[PDB]
Design a protein around this nucleic acid. Structure first.
Ligand SMILES: [Mg+2]
Lengths: 50, 203, 121, 153, 149, 119
RNA sequence: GAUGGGGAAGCUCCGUUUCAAAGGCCUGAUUUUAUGCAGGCCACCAUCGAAAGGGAAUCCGGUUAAGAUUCCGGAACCUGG
RNA sequence: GUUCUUUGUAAAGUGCCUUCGAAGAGUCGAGUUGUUUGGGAAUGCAGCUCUAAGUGGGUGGUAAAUUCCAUCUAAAGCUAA
RNA sequence: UUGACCUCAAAUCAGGUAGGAGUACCCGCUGAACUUAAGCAUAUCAAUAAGCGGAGGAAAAGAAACCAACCGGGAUUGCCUUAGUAACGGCGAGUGAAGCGGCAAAAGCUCAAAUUUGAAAUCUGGUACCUUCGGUGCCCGAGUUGUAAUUUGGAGAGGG
């Protein structure tokens, strides 16, 4: 909603900062098993449930 | 020594002097709260025989509890089972009114330790007890090696674990052939004689 | 003896002398320093093109501000850190969770002159 | 308040009921003139305070240092005896010469047997007003009993 | 259910008996720790013989009264006849039982004789000084065996 | 690089406060450069030096308060020992070693003797 | 929905002004002075519960890629002091 | 083990004679009710009613009366493995 | 009028303490039914699961108001055994201990009820100092409606 509470806006800000792909230099580290952001979230595909 | 006069006078409860005194005191105790602090023991001989000493850090509360059976708390008396468990009214609580009295007193003063309790009065509705409590933080009980055992943390809520006199009475802790079910703890003995013991070289 | 006259059927609790605390020891024994001082309420400026358009046109500085700071603290700390009198402060909370402050200066000072004194232009 | 109401209605009830004669063997207390003169007699025989006890012990220690008397430099005391078990033992041993019983002991069963015991053992007793009066006689707050067991000539 | 000519069995396994199954896998390790406890106790009481002296005493029932065995402690009458107080006997290592009585003169004489031999065999150290070290034995029961009359 | 705690410890509190405010001025001046430069690893040394100065100031003030409360009961709770709640509530060695005089007389009269058994 | 209380072995239940000693309000007086003592007044008796109920006070013009009764220019109003 | 304080005109133990020897109450116990136990004319526990004694009381696995005997000392409390 | 006592309050009074977590094991309360009986109601499952209260490194129990009936044993706990026994049970299904014996470990104890009465000899707190898990001095207070010394039934006390 437009009139939202600060708790909801804080959680929205955190999820907006989490919404990003993998940093590309992570794959160059030794013994790296991380291939991609497996915790990626999109607004069309799944809801936050907050 | 006045204390043996107080004892052997206290055994004449239906003498006219004691029933008049009881009749006045039971009204006086209904007029107060359910749990309230007594300033001094009503029976100082009984208190000091149970272990009270008139020094700083010994506390007496007075308490009344409701008499009678324990009604089974089920909605409209429906038990939903076999007819052997359909009883609601004539069921009895396994602990004593003295035990639940001192347990409520301990919950009221959780910083104290319950030592003992004694009957003082009764009527049709209530039974009246006086509970002796000792403060395990007071320095007169931190010192005085006769009583500093109560400051050990294994004695937290003795009345809740059934370690007072009426607690051991209700748990059945006594020597003898009449107490084979309850001698070292009923559930402990049940586990001990329902355990299956298998050795490495099977006997 | 004679009893005290009472013109009211109500009995009230008598007024008792209430003393103040005289502790034997201090509570925390080292008073904390300033939780929110001038260097903590002003983190850094915002130097996007939208913000930089404001610094000559509106005479408005744009700062990123800690989320615990209000307009009094922002105004006092801008006055203390940059020795500039301010006209007004308007704040918002950005969608990334930070706080942005538009500080409009007085007409005596020039925000374009102050920004490259700070070191960004 | 309820404490005022309880402390008034309790003494109302204690005379509304027919009390059995072991109580109201009390409440015929001593009259005020004879009570005043018996407390005037008892005030001459007062137990020693802490400071005069302390200087008595310093004098005794100095005397056993100089002359080595077996703690017998000080004379024989003459004091009122107090304390309930103490005076009950005195009455049972027939050593008490006059016993005063306070009329307001708040378990009354602490002192109801005392006049009958005094009558059986032949010790003269008096129910007197004021455990606070007995306490200020023996330098306490409350004493609940007092006894003269041996008096000067 | 009931079947061919077999005896009637009574196997009490109708409760949740698999919740209470104690298999003594720790027999060997428990024995090893038990010997460790005995050795560290002996090192802690390094002159003293690890167990108190027990009296000889007659076993109770008609099945076992033909045999004699070890008791809990000596009678106060026995230690007074031996010529030492109960507190002193407890400090020098003699078990004292305040609640058994002497009704049998042979058992009384045997226990008094046993106390006499114990007092002849022990060395009591002075409480303050030299401590003349004396190479402990570990079993007063083995040095004073119980003999059937 | 940064500052060193052992050479910070020789200064007075006003010099420490002034060094702290110049460190904060330097941190602000590095933060306004971080946005223009791609990388600026020099910020971490200034941050750790600020932490070091604050640690030295706090330890100086705490030691002064300890010497103010030296040798008396009722010192503040953050200055007295932490160990655990149960060990703080446990009996002290004196109270645990308190014994009645009757038991003390019995222990003096009949202590556990040392004895050996061969001859 | 706490408290005072009363039930309940207990998790907790009842009740919301009740069988409570339930508090704060202005003038000041004093100018070791702090705020007690001079006073006098009053008896509701926690608190939560509406972005559509009640309610102090802002409009026009312009401006951005994306904000505006919120920014800019002008012109007002209310509350507290 | 080495050393300092002397605790202490203190405390404790032991033999014989004599006078005594205080020992826990709405508890023990009994009836009845419910539950429980291997416990059976009633194993323990609890509710209600009645309610002691002092050469007394409890137990001695068949209820009761009478006469004995044996064995402990309740209704208060601490304690390692 | 003044000063006590008793009882009951109020303080952001001086100093403390309780709550919650964990919960395999421990101490209690409360408490089923599925199942078995070839149906089923007593019974069984089970004095169990679920629920609630309370501890510790163990807990609990523990120094006999015991076991026995013998030439008697001697706190508690645990193991082997007693024993699938005595006994309970629509005497059906099923249930079901304890004494003795061997062993592991072993350890004993203390209050109340007594006049110190030629001296409340006892104790918390505050303050000052010190060698500070505390000590000494001083001052209030607690306490005679009884805090210390003396005794705990195995005894023991008062005299000689
Ligand atoms: Mg009920």
């Amino acid at each position: 909603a437009a009139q939202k509470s600060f708790r909801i806006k804080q959680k929205m800000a955190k999820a907006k900062k989490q919404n990003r792909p993998l940093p590309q230099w992570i794959r160059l580290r030794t013994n790296n098993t991380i291939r991609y952001n497996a915790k990626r979230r999109n607004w069309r595909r799944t809801k936050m449930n907050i | 020594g006045a204390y043996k006069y107080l004892e052997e006078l206290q055994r004449k409860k239906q003498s006219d002097v004691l029933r008049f005194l009881q009749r006045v005191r039971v009204w006086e105790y209904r007029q107060k709260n359910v749990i309230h602090r007594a300033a001094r023991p009503t029976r100082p001989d009984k208190a000091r025989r149970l272990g009270y000493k008139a020094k700083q850090g010994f506390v007496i509360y007075r308490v009344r509890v409701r008499r009678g059976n324990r009604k089974r708390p089920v909605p409209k008396g429906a038990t939903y089972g076999k007819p052997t468990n359909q009883g609601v009214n004539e069921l009895k609580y396994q602990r004593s009114l003295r035990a639940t009295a001192e347990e409520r007193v301990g919950r009221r003063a959780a910083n104290l330790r319950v030592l003992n309790s004694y009957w003082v009065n009764q009527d049709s509705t209530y039974k009246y007890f006086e509970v002796i409590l000792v403060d395990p933080q007071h320095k007169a009980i931190r010192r005085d090696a006769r009583y500093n055992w109560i400051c050990d943390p294994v004695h937290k809520h003795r009345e809740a674990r059934g370690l007072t006199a009426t607690g051991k009475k209700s748990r059945g802790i006594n020597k003898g052939h009449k107490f084979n079910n309850t001698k070292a703890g009923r559930r402990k003995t049940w586990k001990r004689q329902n355990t299956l013991s298998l050795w490495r070289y099977r006997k | 003896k004679a009893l005290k006259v009472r013109t009211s059927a109500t009995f009230r609790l008598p007024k008792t002398l209430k003393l103040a605390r005289a502790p034997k020891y201090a509570s925390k024994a080292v008073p904390h320093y300033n939780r929110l001082d001038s260097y903590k309420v002003i983190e850094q400026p915002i130097t996007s093109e939208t913000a930089m358009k404001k610094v000559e046109d509106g005479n408005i500085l744009v700062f990123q501000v800690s989320m615990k700071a209000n307009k009094y603290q922002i105004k006092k700390a801008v006055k203390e850190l940059y020795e500039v009198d301010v006209l007004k402060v308007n704040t918002l909370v950005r969608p990334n969770g930070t706080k942005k402050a538009y500080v409009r200066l007085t007409a005596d000072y020039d925000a374009l002159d102050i920004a490259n004194r700070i070191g960004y232009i | 308040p309820e404490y005022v109401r309880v402390q008034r209605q309790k003494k109302i009830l204690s005379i509304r009921l027919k009390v059995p004669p072991t109580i109201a063997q009390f409440q015929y207390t001593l009259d005020r003139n004879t009570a005043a003169e018996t407390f005037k007699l008892f005030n001459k025989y007062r137990p020693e305070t802490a400071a005069e006890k302390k200087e008595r012990l310093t004098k005794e220690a100095a005397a056993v240092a100089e002359g080595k008397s077996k703690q017998d430099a000080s004379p024989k005391p003459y004091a009122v005896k107090y304390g309930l078990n103490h005076v009950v033992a005195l009455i049972e041993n027939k050593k008490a010469k006059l016993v005063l019983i306070a009329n307001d002991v708040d378990p009354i069963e602490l002192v109801v047997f005392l006049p009958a015991l005094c009558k059986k053992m032949g010790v003269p007793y008096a129910i007197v007003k004021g455990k606070a009066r007995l306490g200020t006689l023996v330098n306490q707050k409350t004493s609940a009993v007092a006894a003269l067991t041996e008096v000067r000539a | 259910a009931i079947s061919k000519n077999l005896p009637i069995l009574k196997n009490h396994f109708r409760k949740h008996w698999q919740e209470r199954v104690k298999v003594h896998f720790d027999q060997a390790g428990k024995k090893v720790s038990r010997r460790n406890a005995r050795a560290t106790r002996a090192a802690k009481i390094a002159p003293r013989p690890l167990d108190l002296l027990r009296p000889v005493v007659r076993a109770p029932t008609v099945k076992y009264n033909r045999k004699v065995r070890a008791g809990r402690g000596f009678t106060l009458a026995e230690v007074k006849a031996a010529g030492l107080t109960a507190a002193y006997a407890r400090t020098i290592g003699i078990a004292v039982d305040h609640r058994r009585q002497n009704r049998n003169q042979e058992i009384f004489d045997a226990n008094v004789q046993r106390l006499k031999e114990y007092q002849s065999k022990i060395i009591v150290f002075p409480r303050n000084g030299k401590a003349p070290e004396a190479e402990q034995v570990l079993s007063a029961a083995a040095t004073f065996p119980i003999a059937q009359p | 690089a940064g500052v060193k705690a052992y050479e910070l410890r020789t200064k007075s509190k006003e010099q420490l406060a002034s060094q702290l405010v110049d460190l904060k001025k330097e941190l602000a001046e590095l933060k306004v450069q971080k946005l223009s430069r791609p990388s600026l690893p020099k910020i971490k040394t200034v941050r750790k030096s600020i932490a070091c100065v604050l640690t030295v100031i706090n330890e100086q003030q705490r030691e002064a308060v300890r010497q103010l409360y030296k040798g008396k009961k009722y010192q503040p709770k953050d200055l007295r020992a932490k160990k655990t709640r149960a060990l703080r509530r446990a009996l002290t060695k004196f109270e645990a070693s308190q014994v009645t005089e009757k038991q003390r007389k019995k222990q003096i009269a009949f202590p556990q003797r040392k004895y050996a058994i061969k001859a």
